[PDB]
Amino acid sequence: MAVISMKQLLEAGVHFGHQTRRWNPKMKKYIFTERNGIYIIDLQKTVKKVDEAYNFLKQVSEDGGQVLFVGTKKQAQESVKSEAERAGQFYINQRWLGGLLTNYKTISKRIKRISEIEKMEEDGLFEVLPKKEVVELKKEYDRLIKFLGGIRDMKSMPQALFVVDPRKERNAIAEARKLNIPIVGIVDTNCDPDEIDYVIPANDDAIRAVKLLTAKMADAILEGQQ
Amino acid sequence: EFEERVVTINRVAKVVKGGRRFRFTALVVVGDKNGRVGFGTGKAQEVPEAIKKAVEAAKKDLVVVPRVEGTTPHTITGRYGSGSVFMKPAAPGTGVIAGGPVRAVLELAGITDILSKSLGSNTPINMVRATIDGLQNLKNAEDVAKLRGKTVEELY
Amino acid sequence: GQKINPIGLRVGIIRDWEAKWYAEKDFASLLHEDLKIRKFIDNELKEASVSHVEIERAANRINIAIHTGKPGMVIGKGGSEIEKLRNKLNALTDKKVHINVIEIKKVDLDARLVAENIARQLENRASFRRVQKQAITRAMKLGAKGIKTQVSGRLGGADIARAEQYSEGTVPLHTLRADIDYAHAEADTTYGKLGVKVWIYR
RNA sequence: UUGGGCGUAAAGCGCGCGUAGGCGGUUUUUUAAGUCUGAUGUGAAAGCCCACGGCUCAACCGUGGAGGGUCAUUGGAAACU
RNA sequence: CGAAGGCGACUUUCUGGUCUGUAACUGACGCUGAUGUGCGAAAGCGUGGGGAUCAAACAGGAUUAGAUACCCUGGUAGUCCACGCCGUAAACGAUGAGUGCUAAGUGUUAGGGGGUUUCCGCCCCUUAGUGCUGCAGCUAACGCAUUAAGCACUCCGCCUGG
RNA sequence: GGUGGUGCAUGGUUGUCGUCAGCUCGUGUCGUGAGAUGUUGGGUUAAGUCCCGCAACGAGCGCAACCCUUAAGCUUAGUUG
């Protein structure tokens, strides 16, 4: 669906950021002020432009674009992962090897690699797969399924994401921009406004931000799908 | 909508253990000749294969030229770094008016009315830069005259 | 390049032994009757380009065991060359009746005796890439075990061979029961020796 | 200028300190002197537009208009001077 | 901080000048550039010292299978300060000096506005700078950049083969 | 037929970097370019063989107790042992 509720948005931690001089003059279009350093969202396009992000995803999911709700912050390694799952996707809770999509087309293979090594550990004849094999298979499995989840079983691509600190996690976005895809995001302070078409300095502490928007966007790929 | 043309090649041979390969790193323009001349590059290897293995990389991103057809009515040029060219517009009833390496890309975008003041540096890789500088920084006429608050011809 | 000449690679699983010889008497003359006859067919089979070595002397009722499976040269038509050797190779062996031959299935896949199939790809030195050396590009990727290719046969007077490489990759690369052999032949360098060292990989 | 730059590469000063000056910030306002003269008498050849004749084609020659549409001659007046 | 070479014991000086907070005020009254300004370190440099230290030379020693040399006391001057400087250093910014910015940030010397005053400290604005990075720009890249190796208005000189 | 000479005419013959445990390679992929992956920062066995953290994933090349060998049975049995 479209909008977040306003209270746990406001008071339960979206507007908060970090200290000044970790400063974003580039996200000034959504930054209101700072409380002894700790920034504040301009608290109106955190909902109005959130509805416009919903509409951006409406005609994206009405044709089959399910957004990956990504695991970057520590509640995102579980709950934003989880609403990615509610959307009908998997999660990303492991790290890049340093340029997989800016150096794209060899360990861009990791999409098929997780589609194959996981399914081969899963399919029949797992007994036939010996224990000498199963040792390394299970030592790699904890790193494998957590590696890539956006195109795991929703094996089309998401036309957006929901990032928090693309200040670092533009390793996904900016490297995928080789692949020419737009991104929406509930960003943190002193992060990227450019690669993300819709940024709001949303502190992660408001789980209303991840439920009544990002899981609500798992719902917008149902209502904004039909 | 892009333009089809071959640009060049290059045989890379690095100081390595065994025999030095000669991968024919090639740049190609591809499309069906609209006006939006889209070139690209590629690092490819085999003598008959590296044309297509490099056009593979070329078409990954092939650039747009928003082309004021007939002719860009005013002086049309551009620049990046050490690369640049110039084009003084002349009459279209003149045949082909071009320079040395820019001759076939003059035929790519359909204007064939401006001349090619072949300026720029002497750098071959950035010869492509000097070429594409001239026609990458363009903007149409009526859209600018609209963008400037007035009509298409209130400003004329 | 300070290299010795191998023959046997990994013998004990993959490499085997086709010793079926019973000519027990006269190691000076009856042995000669089956070893010196091997000095005979180097010329006639017309660029044989053959598979491997499978010799066998059937309890001294010696029917000659060298296949060279390119047909026609050893077949004839319903027992012409074989029946002719039934009377001719009585000087080779005791009887030598109806000498045999096989069918060769991608003979460039055979690790050992492929060297003739490629010595007759560049020894001509005249259209020595397409008319003759087509088969380096035909016999490339049938998945042979020993993956190593080189050619040195009279290219400008070359006294060494050639190699091709690129770079990346990860594997547990240790394997201990493969099969491969040598190659060395009789081109004339005219000043300083090189018998062409010649293999390909399928 | 139009159609070069000067760290390395064609080239940027131990140094700074200084007069004329070049240029230093201007805000208003008057002249017509210059900032595509008005229009014409108005224009060097192998050289301002066409017509020409002869040129074995040519090789090469010349001719008229256009005399220009190019200077002079007349002008006075912005939002710089 | 100085015109630089450069500028170092401290009580003090002029605190000249930087310097930021105030700047109390007539009306272009400046950078570079004819003028002209001075010197520039030492090697060396025109007097007593000076062989006192250090110190070339010499001695005298010898590596392991090699000196008088790395080695140097006596010691040659020299070294050095109370009377004369050259116009040279990696004085390099290989990067000339005026008007102003290039997302900007950055902790900070100075001087200030301050809140809180603290217990002379925490927080905000601050600039000559101080550094750090870092936007644009920059050149081939080295790499430069709110303080250039960029950006728009000033001059200078250089050179477009060496 | 050479022994008279040339390995040097080439088969060769072959001693020989060097058991180097190493030599690697594709799918490829980044660096405008002169440059970048494997076999990893913390801890584990006979032949470049990895995990929490590193640009990797996929095969060979020299070489498994490899088939003997020492063995425990047997097996086969009295034949000659």
Helix (H) or strand (E) holding A199: strand A196-199
Experimental determination technique: cryo-EM
C166 touches chain B (CB under 8 A): yes
Within its chain, how far is the Cα of A11 from the centroid? 23
Q: Which residue of B has its CA nearest to C164?
A: B19
Q: Among residues C122, C134, C130, C68, which one has the least CA distance to residue C99?
A: C68
Strand partners, C155: none
Query: Which amino acid does the sequence have at A114?
Result: I
Separation between Cα atoms, residue A34 and residue A10, nearest integer Å: 14
Instruction: Give A52 CA → E107 C1' in Å.
Output: 41
Separation between Cα atoms, residue C201 and residue C144, nearest integer Å: 6
3-state per-residue secondary structure call for B77-113: EEEECCEEEEECECCCCCCCCCCCCCHHHHCCCCCCC
Q: Measured between beta carbons, which residues in chain B are less than 8 angstroms from residue C163?
A: 18-19
Separation between Cα atoms, residue C117 and residue C122, nearest integer Å: 10
Q: Please report the resolution in angstroms.
A: 3.6
C168 touches chain B (CB under 8 A): no
Is C111 in contact with C179 (CB distance < 8 Å)?
Answer: yes
Separation between Cα atoms, residue A20 and residue A33, nearest integer Å: 10
Is B90 in contact with B97 (CB distance < 8 Å)?
Answer: yes
* Contact positions of strand E to protein Cβ (< 7 A): 103-107, 123-125, 138-140
Is B51 in contact with B20 (CB distance < 8 Å)?
Answer: no
CA distance B148 to chain C (A): 55
Query: Which amino acid does the sequence have at A17?
Result: G
What is the CB neighbour count within 10 angstroms for residue C76? Answer: 14
Beta strands (DSSP E) in chain B are: 5-8, 11-12, 23-24, 27-29, 39-40, 76-80, 83-87
- Asked if C163 lies within 8 A of B19 by C-beta distance, the reply is yes
Token digits of residue A146:
């957590």
Are β-strands A196-199 and A183-185 bridged in parallel, bridged antiparallel, or unpaired?
Answer: parallel
Instruction: Give B156 CA → D37 C1' in Å.
Output: 27
Distances (CA, A) of C38 to A114, A146, A221, C64: 57, 65, 79, 10
**How many residues are there in chain A?**
226
| Torsion sign across C-alpha atoms A176, A178, A179, A184 | positive
Helix (H) or strand (E) holding A167: helix A166-176
Separation between Cα atoms, residue B12 and residue A217, nearest integer Å: 50
